[PDB]
Amino acid sequence: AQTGFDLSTATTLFWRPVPVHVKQQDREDVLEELTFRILTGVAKQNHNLRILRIHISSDSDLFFLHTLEVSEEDFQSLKNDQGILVDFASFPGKIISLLEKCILAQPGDSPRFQAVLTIRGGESVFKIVEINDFKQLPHITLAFRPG
Amino acid sequence: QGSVSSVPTKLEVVAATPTSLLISWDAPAVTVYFYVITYGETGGNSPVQEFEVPGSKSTATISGLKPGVDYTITVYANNKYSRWYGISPISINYRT
């Protein structure tokens, strides 16, 4: 919408399933493998605006799609809401290494990293939490959008 | 330390058509972010084709080859070692 992702000169960073606990309004909770595709690119009218794009889809439902786009300008607001201490240049690697932690996670792990997606119609909230002996601890929280 | 391998292994052709191939390989120890598959004619100096396959997949189909020519097929994995260490590919040559 805002951003203007080029998509024709995008760089692929990550494209694989991730186990996600999906929480829906009027449905029972589901543990399913969702496909994450992470790209970076630039705007179509401004090659100097870097943009991070994340698309969540499933192999079982083709019309299921949730998207997130963070421009480098957007990142400054987001970096202060969550107390993020890395720069935009390194931000995608931190997301990827958290996703990697949830791929490698095992039921008996403690701390155990876990990916969660909650869906309200036209808005979804994605978080990766670390469950330890004392609390569920969010490492990142990201607002997604249908389509 | 076989724990830290990032190169796929035992890349092989499992099925073939005059112009089509089905290749497969075993994943490395590290988590694969996605795979890059490359192919071109084994005779030098004409371009390698490339495409991406998800990190969970272990096979891919290739189209549009010349019958009776050998291609150098290469697979490598994007993974945690991709930022600061070189591309670590496995390669085979296959005819028809």
- Indicate the domain borders of chain B: 1-96
Angle, alpha carbons B74-B76-B77 (nearest 5°) = 160
Q: Do A17 and B56 touch (CB under 8 A)?
A: yes
| Residues of B whose CB is below 8 A from A35 | 54
DSSP state of A5: B
For residue B34, give how far its alpha carbon lies from the nearest alpha carbon of chain A (Å). 5
Verify cis geometry, omega within 30 degrees of 0, for the bond prior to B54. no
Contact (CB, 8 A) for B34 and B78: yes
- Rounded Cα–Cα distance for residues B95 and B16 (Å): 10
For chain A, give every domain's residue range: 1-147
| Residues of B whose CB is below 8 A from A14 | 33-34, 55, 78
The SS3 of residue A57 is strand
DSSP state of A129: E
Instruction: Name which of A137, A74, A90, A143 is nearest A111 in CA terms.
Output: A137
- For B57, the closest chain A residue by CA position comes to A16
Q: What six digits make up the tokens of A34?
A: 């969702």
Contact (CB, 8 A) for B96 and B73: no
Q: Are strands A11-24 and A30-42 parallel, antiparallel or unpaired?
A: antiparallel
Q: Which residue has 């019958």 as its token pair?
A: B67
Structural element, H or E, at residue A112: strand A112-119
Q: Which residue has 């993974």 as its token pair?
A: B79
For residue B53, give how far its alpha carbon lies from the nearest alpha carbon of chain A (Å). 8
- Rounded Cα–Cα distance for residues A42 and A50 (Å): 5
Contact (CB, 8 A) for B96 and B18: yes
Contact (CB, 8 A) for A117 and A126: yes
- Rounded Cα–Cα distance for residues B96 and B20 (Å): 8
**Strands, E assignment, B1-96:** 9-17, 20-26, 34-41, 49-54, 59-62, 70-78, 90-95
- Rounded Cα–Cα distance for residues A14 and B52 (Å): 10
Amino acid type, B27? A
Instruction: Name which of A79, A65, A90, A72 is nearest A13 in CA terms.
Output: A90
Contacts of B44 (CB under 8 A, 6+ apart): none
- What is the radius of gyration, based on Cα positions, of chain A? 15
Please, what is the end-to-end C-alpha distance for chain A in angstroms? 11
**Resolution, in Å, please?**
2.0
DSSP state of A75: H
| Residues of B whose CB is below 8 A from A96 | 33
| Residues of B whose CB is below 8 A from A16 | 32-34, 54-56
Report CA-CA distances (Å) from B17 to A88, B61, B95: 46, 11, 11
- Rounded Cα–Cα distance for residues A98 and A128 (Å): 7
Phi, psi of B61 (to 5 degrees): -105, 140
Q: Which residues of A83-100 are buried (b: 16+ CB within 10 A; e: fewer)?
A: eeeeebeebbeebbebbb
Q: In whole angstroms, what separates CA A116 from the centre of its chain?
A: 10
Structural element, H or E, at residue A95: helix A91-104
Q: Do A16 and B80 touch (CB under 8 A)?
A: no
Q: Which residues are B38's β-sheet partners?
A: B50, B74
For residue A26, give how far its alpha carbon lies from the nearest alpha carbon of chain B (Å). 31
Q: In whole angstroms, what separates CA B62 from the centre of its chain?
A: 10
State the sign of the Cα–Cα–Cα–Cα dihedral B22, B23, B26, B28.
Answer: negative
Q: What six digits make up the tokens of B11?
A: 């890349």
